[PDB]
């Protein structure tokens, strides 16, 4: 009764980072060692837990969050990070228990002339809390004058497009990211290794 991690890692399309997706993993058996040992994952960094011990543990729920950012931003998907992505799009807590997995997806997510489907949030009144998700498109008030819902002077639509294009340098190429978080509750632990 295997955990359906394939639906996460092998999805055709990933979400924009500002609208990141989450899959709840429960009541199943998962072989984390198979993922951790795959060379196709160039980032596979765990926090508060050892990747090689994951097959020895049970959790009540496992959460798999997935999205696309560009290469230079993968470093922001870590505890303690700041920047547009960490501050405004996807935020890990200081005391994160889980793993960050990423791989270059230029062959999947770029297109000649640009793939404009993947967006990022550039402005926000405050930083996201850990695991908070903000998909609003209210006009951002950059200055002293209220915006009243209309773009204008110091009044910005909050999102931009990556426009991923295949000859971008690697720091501007798309990377698919999967964040696994391991949750232990009073409820029974239903997600175990082999």
């Amino acid at each position, epitope marked *: 009764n295997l955990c359906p991690f394939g639906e996460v890692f092998n999805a055709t399309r990933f979400a924009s980072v500002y609208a990141w997706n989450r899959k709840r993993i429960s009541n199943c058996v998962a072989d984390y060692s198979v993922l951790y040992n795959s060379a196709s994952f160039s980032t596979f960094k765990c926090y508060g837990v050892s990747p090689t011990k994951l097959n020895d543990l049970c959790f009540t729920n496992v959460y798999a969050d997935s999205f696309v950012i560009r290469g230079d931003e993968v470093r922001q998907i870590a505890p303690g990070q700041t920047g547009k992505i960490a501050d405004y799009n996807y935020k890990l807590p200081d005391d994160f228990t889980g793993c960050v997995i990423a791989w270059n997806s230029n062959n999947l997510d770029s297109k000649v002339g640009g793939n404009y489907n993947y967006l990022y949030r550039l402005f926000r009144k405050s930083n996201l809390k850990p695991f908070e998700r903000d998909i609003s498109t209210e006009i951002y008030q950059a200055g002293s004058t209220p915006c009243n819902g209309v773009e204008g002077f110091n009044c910005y639509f909050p999102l931009q497009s990556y426009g991923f*294009q295949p000859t971008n340098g690697v720091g*501007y190429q798309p990377y698919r990211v999967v964040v696994l978080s391991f949750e232990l509750l009073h409820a029974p632990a239903t997600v175990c290794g082999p």
Partner: nanobody
Amino acid sequence: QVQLVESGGGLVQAGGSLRLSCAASGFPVYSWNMWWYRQAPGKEREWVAAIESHGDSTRYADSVKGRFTISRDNAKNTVYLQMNSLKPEDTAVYYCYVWVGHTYYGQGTQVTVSA
């Protein structure tokens, strides 16, 4: 409402220079990422250069690095592509792209380099 109108192309001799113009209407150019592409007959569209929204950070394809420069004239609501040291293989139609909810495209301007 929104449109991108290009100008400044034309015929120029190898080693010379041109300044392409991408004039926007319906949004401020400083608020949005902009990309420049080019296409030569029988070849695919080729990314050339880009400038980020709300800032001055730029990037360039290896083929034009050091010779092409993006800049903005916010008073004119215009983004320029300065092209120096032109070679015959720079001949192509040049386009500017801007995403504003969806992608808008300049009409293109022909650059032909002679030797």
